Design an enzyme around this catalytic site. Structure first.
Site, short mmCIF file in Angstrom:
data_model
loop_
_atom_site.label_atom_id
_atom_site.label_comp_id
_atom_site.label_asym_id
_atom_site.label_seq_id
_atom_site.Cartn_x
_atom_site.Cartn_y
_atom_site.Cartn_z
N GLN A 20 0.82 -1.21 0.00
CA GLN A 20 0.00 0.00 0.00
C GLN A 20 0.86 1.26 0.00
OE1 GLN A 20 -2.65 2.47 2.90
NE2 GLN A 20 -3.25 0.32 3.08
N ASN A 56 8.85 8.09 8.81
CA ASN A 56 7.84 9.12 8.62
C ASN A 56 8.01 10.29 9.59
OD1 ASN A 56 6.72 7.55 6.60
ND2 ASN A 56 5.14 6.67 7.92
N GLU A 106 27.44 4.70 -11.28
CA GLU A 106 28.51 5.40 -10.60
C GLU A 106 28.16 5.74 -9.16
OE1 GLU A 106 30.04 7.66 -14.71
OE2 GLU A 106 29.61 8.80 -12.89
N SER A 153 7.01 -0.16 1.81
CA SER A 153 6.96 0.13 3.24
C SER A 153 7.29 -1.14 4.01
CB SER A 153 5.59 0.67 3.63
OG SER A 153 4.64 -0.38 3.73
N1 LIG Z 1 5.56 7.23 4.03
C1 LIG Z 1 4.45 6.50 3.97
N2 LIG Z 1 4.33 5.35 4.73
C2 LIG Z 1 3.20 4.61 4.67
C3 LIG Z 1 2.15 4.99 3.86
N3 LIG Z 1 1.17 4.09 3.99
C4 LIG Z 1 1.57 3.14 4.87
N4 LIG Z 1 2.82 3.45 5.31
C5 LIG Z 1 3.64 2.68 6.26
O1 LIG Z 1 3.49 1.30 6.01
C6 LIG Z 1 3.48 0.56 7.22
C7 LIG Z 1 2.60 -0.68 7.09
O2 LIG Z 1 2.68 -1.22 5.79
P1 LIG Z 1 1.60 -0.81 4.68
O3 LIG Z 1 2.27 -0.26 3.45
O4 LIG Z 1 0.63 0.20 5.25
O5 LIG Z 1 0.81 -2.17 4.34
P2 LIG Z 1 1.47 -3.27 3.37
O6 LIG Z 1 2.92 -2.94 3.11
O7 LIG Z 1 0.69 -3.32 2.09
O8 LIG Z 1 1.35 -4.66 4.16
P3 LIG Z 1 -0.10 -5.29 4.51
O9 LIG Z 1 -0.53 -4.77 5.85
O10 LIG Z 1 0.02 -6.79 4.56
O11 LIG Z 1 -1.11 -4.89 3.46
C8 LIG Z 1 2.95 1.52 8.27
O12 LIG Z 1 3.69 1.38 9.46
C9 LIG Z 1 3.15 2.91 7.69
O13 LIG Z 1 4.13 3.60 8.43
C10 LIG Z 1 2.26 6.15 3.09
O14 LIG Z 1 1.34 6.50 2.36
N5 LIG Z 1 3.42 6.90 3.15
MG LIG Z 2 -2.28 -3.49 2.73
#
Ligand SMILES: Nc1nc2c(ncn2[C@@H]2O[C@H](COP(=O)(O)OP(=O)(O)OP(=O)(O)O)[C@@H](O)[C@H]2O)c(=O)[nH]1
Ligand SMILES: [Mg+2]
Ligand SMILES: Nc1nc2c(ncn2[C@@H]2O[C@H](COP(=O)(O)OP(=O)(O)OP(=O)(O)O)[C@@H](O)[C@H]2O)c(=O)[nH]1
Ligand SMILES: Nc1nc2c(ncn2[C@@H]2O[C@H](COP(=O)(O)OP(=O)(O)O)[C@@H](O)[C@H]2O)c(=O)[nH]1
Ligand SMILES: [Mg+2]
EC number: 3.6.5.-
Lengths: 430, 103, 430, 430
Positions: free
Chosen positions: D11, D197, D245, D131
């Site tokens: 996500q 973040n 590089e 993430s």
């Molecule tokens: N910088 C940033 N971090 C994000 C964002 N959305 C989620 N995160 C981070 O992602 C972490 C959790 O993973 P997610 O990306 O939300 O979910 P996922 O990687 O798809 O894993 P699943 O829960 O199995 O779906 C959280 O702790 C957030 O800090 C975003 O839009 N921007």
């Molecule tokens: Mg997810």
């Protein structure tokens, strides 16, 4: 006088001729309606070499077109300069060979060849003084490689003293369009060595390489390969149709380029060749022509000429130029490359000058060199042949029309013997 | 020459199910002497008496030759049109390269 | 002066014949009434003034499909008395359509075949279509092939049979007659192409994005494949291929002539134009195992020979540059005794689109006909299905009571065992 | 002839990919429909006529985000079948997305990667976004990296991972999968950039003066950093830098490739133009500890190497005059065995502004990628968080029951201990 007739067979040969005759007609100023509209007097003096004369003042090529299927000749007639060919010379069957050498040489090609031999005999008996015949055909097809080679033997049996030319396209393993190419290539090479006075191998792979690297055009087509082959074909007989400092007919080249009667497989190349965007940068000089002439990538074959030593070489310069420069440059190209020239025959480069250049060009060169590097093509052809034959793959198609495996064994043995005895002279020393 | 227009012209595709929708949307006889005017057999009564295969054949033969001649000129022109485009395109390529370089 | 005759027998055969005959009429500009408002001669014949008559014959014992044909929009096209129809259906019983009711109908079909053949002067060969898992289709196809093999002899016959899917099936007794028909056409047909429905269902689902396909969508793809195969006979091309030029290139041995096909590209107008459809990507898609037109995995076996047709504005050099890439890949391996295995054909006419259909209009397409060692799996699974019920002699009484002998089932089993042993013997390296 | 492929999984990865793909389309003048109303080639590909297709692939097991993408304004841009979507989410479980449901999806992603790579001719490398604190993101990123490292080998891969904040956290189990994913990408990724973040929240609050930021504001800054990093490949510059590089300039040893980034200036249009934004002041702001893009203090450790990119109208002499000032300061000290540690790049294209966004339009900007010894603190605190719950084996049953072995947790702990020891061993002077 000393004219030659044109005979072509198969689809590839017909497509080569469809551009060769266009090039010749454009060179002599003949319109697609057979009417002369040239500018120079010399354009008509020796027109009897390739063209006949009929009532009404129009000219007709002395070409004979043969194939086992009617499609290709029904298509070449609608193309430009297609009306020049006499309708009587078109001979064809109703069945075809299907890329099967046996069908085009034993069952179907044997019955049809009488009609084409009739018109061939009509053409040769009539002409003033015969010089010889030139043959265009492909070794990758059945009907071509069968009927053409059997016709070679039939012509040789009746005219043993005339000269015979063959421009043969051999199937390269890189660009393969037919799975049964090794069989009819190996069978054809067996018969071709016994009867052809001269043979010139041409490869589609080398033509694509040249078009992509030297001309640098984006999308090559068969029209460009045909145009290059046609220019190379025309360059050989130029001095026989035009005056020059040192005229040299085909027989003179035959004397000077064939040391032993079984070594008559040459590879050729044409210069100059430049891209459209760089045609203004370059300046046409004899050094510039001779440096491109001996270039390895410029050869019309994928064979690498620095993998062997030249037995002899020939060059047919075109245009008006000084002979002293030509001779000194030929000497220089032979002193700086002594390692790639066989040492027991000194002064093994022949030169000729013709004062009439090609239309649109001021200087041109045609190169015909007999080299030991040609062994690699027969090596790979025989390698594929023996890889496929050991399992008797696709053998039943050939054996169902009266042929046997003994003729395959003899052909393989003779081809290997040719390969061996061609390189025998490479290691020979004085 | 395979060809398509701009993206806007097609305008059906952004996650279309219309195609799925279209499938849902589909859910003493006297015939010897009286052959039909359309048929080849019918020869007019008035013309029933021209008795010469010679003259008729010559005119027919002349016509049969002529169609072939016009056909040949047309098919050759089509051949010329593919080749012309290729020649033009190579020349065009050089001009274009030139154009970008000048830009 | 080149002709071909197509035979349609059974419900599936007639329903795919309808599919190919809209496409041919559309491609040659002929209206459904048969009237135009020199390439037609391959499939049609001129009546002297006006309409054209297809060189096709429709066979069936069950009258419903023929009656549907004779009342649709194409009622005026076909000759009224070449739509041979019976009264009683064979009802999925092979012995019925080979021994009981097919014999009284086969004579009329042979008379029609003779009456159509005497008109042709350059007959290339026959085409036949029949769904294998049915009584009348398999039985009448076997009987017609057996009669034609002796009436005409060496003329080439091509069979576009539709074998049952691995697990998906409509009948319960189709393995029996499938095995018997394979026995019959093993020694009687020159080419057999695999066409099971499950693979084409997956193709439609994945590419065409249709979730509820019907038989018409399958038959349109089959018709496109047929048109691509036979385009080279009726359109000008840089590298032509004839029907008779197949057993010399795809059939290593007389017994082995079952091969599986593929087509590319398959894409809808909603997302076709967003991507360039280069020749390299289409020739890569054609070799993908998931795009096989028969549910077999080519990764499980070697390749023997690949014959693949292009049409459109493709240039030969781009074809060679893509054959090299495929030879490079490590997931596709050819048999040891075949160094080159590709036969390439190039045609200029782009594929035609049928209005209201699924496929969009594109300028480039590729159709491949590939012979591979992996085809033995369908034979093995059909054999396993056959053995399960033949162990207890189930459903045999429906066949013994229709004139067939008890031992006729065993010899088909022995021939399948021989074929499976032969496929294993060929695929081992030397 | 230079290309790069970006991979978006999870996500957070998809939501930052959207952010970077508005910016690239805006910077190259391409409308959201994909149509222009030679620099695009790095990120896009030409379809022959009209639209451009991004060289990006979107991955997720949970369909909501992809469905949101496929209905927004950018529905026409991406190819319909490169937005691979699953059915069942991993639900923050690492073992799920590495052993249970990710394996059945990874094959389609690898097929898409191959289909995109065969189009590129000068492939520079891969980009990946994920993430770390999530199941599917970390697990699928690990699996994809492991497959790519063996399918392609020496091609460079760059990872823009977002580690959890020191104290701020959204999940409760993210240390476990963060540690496991760090284990996986430690030996498999060439570059890893820190992106937690909390630091970016502080940056927005202090500079942009936004008191209620959302994820979009963070993702826009990340997109700007990516654009600044990759500008040198698609715009003319006085001092160019390529992706390849980097390991020769920022990576002293194969194990040490985690570095933290910073960007300057960050300012709103309401007060941007009141000050001159000289190069000296922006390069001073970039080195401020409070402007680090990851919540780490550089004053707690040495520097190893600094690679920092400029873009706009900056002159090299002004850059040198500012590097000297930084070398002068006593609060910034480099490691002993590195006399010079700066790599400088200069580009001419000023950063582009996104309408409705936060950042204003400026003529000068600086982006630094700095490798420092102080990064070990995040590893130490993540390790401390991990140990607290691993002492009592909490939440382990959610991982053991998804196919993962008991001992797999310990070796990640050992690798982190090894990394922390290595960072201490490198930072001591000789
Ligand atoms: N910088 C940033 N971090 C994000 C964002 N959305 C989620 N995160 C981070 O992602 C972490 C959790 O993973 P997610 O990306 O939300 O979910 P996922 O990687 O798809 O894993 P699943 O829960 O199995 O779906 C959280 O702790 C957030 O800090 C975003 O839009 N921007
Ligand atoms: Mg997810
Ligand atoms: N591809 C394709 N296969 C079909 C079609 N119609 C029937 N079949 C196949 O044909 C098999 C049975 O044979 P049919 O053609 O339906 O019937 P038949 O050949 O006339 O034999 P009878 O049952 O005696 O009438 C089924 O298993 C189907 O898979 C069709 O329209 N397209
Ligand atoms: N130069 C050139 N070569 C061609 C052309 N057409 C076909 N060929 C070559 O001829 C080979 C096939 O020969 P084929 O047509 O079967 O000869 P045939 O059996 O006598 O008709 C292919 O490998 C092509 O490379 C053409 O127009 N020009
Ligand atoms: Mg039926």
């Amino acid at each position: 006088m000393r004219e030659i007739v044109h005979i072509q067979g198969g689809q590839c040969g017909n497509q080569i001729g469809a551009k060769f005759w266009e090039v010749i007609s454009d060179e002599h100023g003949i319109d697609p309606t057979g009417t002369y509209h040239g500018d120079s007097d010399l354009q008509l003096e020796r027109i009897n070499v390739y063209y006949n004369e009929a009532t009404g003042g129009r000219y007709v090529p002395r070409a004979i077109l043969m194939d086992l299927e009617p499609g290709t000749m029904d298509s070449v007639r609608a193309g430009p300069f297609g009306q020049l060919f006499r309708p009587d010379n078109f001979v064809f069957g109703q069945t075809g060979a299907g890329n099967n050498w046996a069908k085009g040489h034993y069952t179907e090609g044997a019955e049809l060849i009488d009609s084409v031999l009739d018109v061939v005999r009509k053409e040769a008996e009539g002409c003033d003084c015969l010089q010889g015949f030139q043959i265009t055909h492909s070794l990758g097809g059945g009907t071509g490689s069968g009927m053409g080679t059997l016709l070679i033997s039939k012509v040789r049996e009746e005219y043993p003293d005339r000269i015979m030319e063959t421009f043969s396209v051999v199937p390269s393993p890189k660009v393969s369009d037919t799975v049964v190419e090794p069989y009819n290539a190996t069978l054809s090479v067996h018969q071709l060595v016994e009867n052809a006075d001269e043979c010139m191998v041409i490869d589609n792979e080398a033509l694509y390489d040249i078009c992509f690297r030297t001309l640098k055009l984006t999308t090559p087509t068969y029209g460009d390969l045909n145009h290059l082959v046609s220019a190379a074909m025309s360059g050989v007989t130029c001095c026989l149709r035009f005056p020059g400092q040192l005229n040299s007919d085909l027989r003179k080249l035959a004397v000077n380029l064939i040391p032993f009667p079984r070594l008559h497989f040459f590879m050729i190349g044409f210069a100059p060749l430049t891209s459209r965007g760089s045609q203004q940068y370059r300046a046409l000089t004899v050094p510039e022509l001779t440096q491109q002439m001996f270039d390895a990538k410029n050869m019309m074959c994928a064979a690498d000429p620095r993998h062997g030593r030249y037995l002899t070489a020939s060059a047919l310069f075109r245009g008006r130029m000084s002979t002293k420069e030509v001779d000194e440059q030929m000497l220089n190209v032979q002193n700086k490359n002594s390692s790639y020239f066989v040492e027991w025959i000194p002064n093994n480069i022949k030169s000729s000058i013709c004062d009439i250049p090609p239309k649109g060009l001021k200087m041109a060169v045609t190169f015909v060199g007999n080299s030991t590097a040609i062994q690699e093509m027969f090596k790979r052809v025989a390698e594929q042949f023996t890889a496929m034959f050991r399992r008797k793959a696709f053998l039943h198609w050939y054996t169902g029309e009266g042929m046997d495996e003994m003729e395959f064994t003899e052909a393989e043995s003779n081809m290997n013997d040719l390969v061996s005895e061609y390189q025998q002279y490479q290691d020979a020393t004085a | 020459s395979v060809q398509p227009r701009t993206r806007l012209e097609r305008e059906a595709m952004k996650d279309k199910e219309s195609i799925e929708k279209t499938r849902i949307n589909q859910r003493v006889k006297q015939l010897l002497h009286n052959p039909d005017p359309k048929s080849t057999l019918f020869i007019p009564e008035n013309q029933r008496f021209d008795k010469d295969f010679s003259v008729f054949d010559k005119q027919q033969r002349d016509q049969r030759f002529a169609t072939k001649e016009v056909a040949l000129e047309k098919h050759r022109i089509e051949a010329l049109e593919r080749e012309s485009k290729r020649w033009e395109q190579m020349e065009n390529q050089v001009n274009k390269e030139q154009v970008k370089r000048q830009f | 002066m080149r002709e071909v005759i197509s035979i349609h027998v059974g419900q599936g055969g007639i329903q795919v014949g309808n599919a190919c005959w809209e496409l041919f009429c559309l491609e040659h500009g002929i209206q459904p009434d048969g009237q135009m408002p020199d390439a037609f001669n391959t499939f049609f014949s001129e009546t002297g003034a006006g309409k054209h008559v297809p060189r096709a014959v429709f066979l069936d014992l069950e009258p419903t499909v023929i009656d549907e044909v004779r009342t649709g929009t194409y009622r005026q096209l076909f000759h009224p008395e070449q739509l041979i129809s019976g009264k009683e259906d064979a009802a999925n019983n092979f012995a019925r359509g080979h021994y009981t009711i097919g014999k009284e109908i086969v004579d009329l079909c042979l008379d029609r075949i003779r009456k159509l053949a005497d008109n042709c002067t350059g007959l290339q060969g026959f085409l036949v279509f029949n769904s294998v898992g049915g009584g009348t289709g398999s039985g009448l196809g076997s009987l017609l092939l057996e009669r034609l093999s002796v009436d005409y002899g060496k003329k080439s016959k091509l069979g576009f049979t539709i074998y049952p899917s691995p697990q998906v099936s409509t009948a319960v007794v189709e393995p029996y007659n499938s095995i018997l028909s394979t026995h019959s056409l093993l020694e009687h047909t020159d080419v057999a192409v695999m066409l099971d429905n499950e693979a084409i269902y997956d193709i439609c689902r994945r590419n065409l994005d249709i979730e509820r396909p019907t038989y018409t969508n399958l038959n349109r793809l089959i018709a496109q494949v047929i048109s691509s195969l036979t385009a080279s006979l009726r359109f000008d091309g840089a590298l032509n291929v004839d029907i008779t030029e197949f057993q010399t290139n795809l059939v290593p041995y007389p017994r082995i002539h079952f091969m599986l096909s593929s087509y590319a590209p398959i894409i809808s107008a909603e997302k076709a134009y967003h991507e360039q459809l280069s020749v390299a990507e289409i020739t890569n898609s054609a070799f993908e195992p998931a795009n096989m037109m028969a549910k077999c995995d080519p990764r499980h076996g070697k390749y023997m020979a690949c014959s693949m047709m292009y049409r459109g504005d493709v240039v030969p050099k781009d074809v060679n540059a893509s054959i090299a890439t495929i030879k490079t890949k490590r997931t596709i391996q050819f048999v040891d005794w075949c160094p080159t295995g590709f036969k390439v054909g190039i045609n200029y006419q782009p594929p035609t689109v049928v209005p209201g259909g699924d496929l969009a209009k594109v300028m480039r397409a590729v159709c491949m006909i590939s012979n591979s060692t992996a085809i033995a799996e369908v034979f093995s699974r059909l054999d396993h299905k056959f053995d399960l019920m033949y162990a207890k002699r189930a459903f045999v009484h429906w066949y013994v009571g229709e004139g067939m002998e008890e031992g006729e089932f065993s010899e088909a089993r022995e021939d399948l065992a021989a074929l499976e042993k032969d496929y294993e013997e060929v695929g081992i390296e030397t």
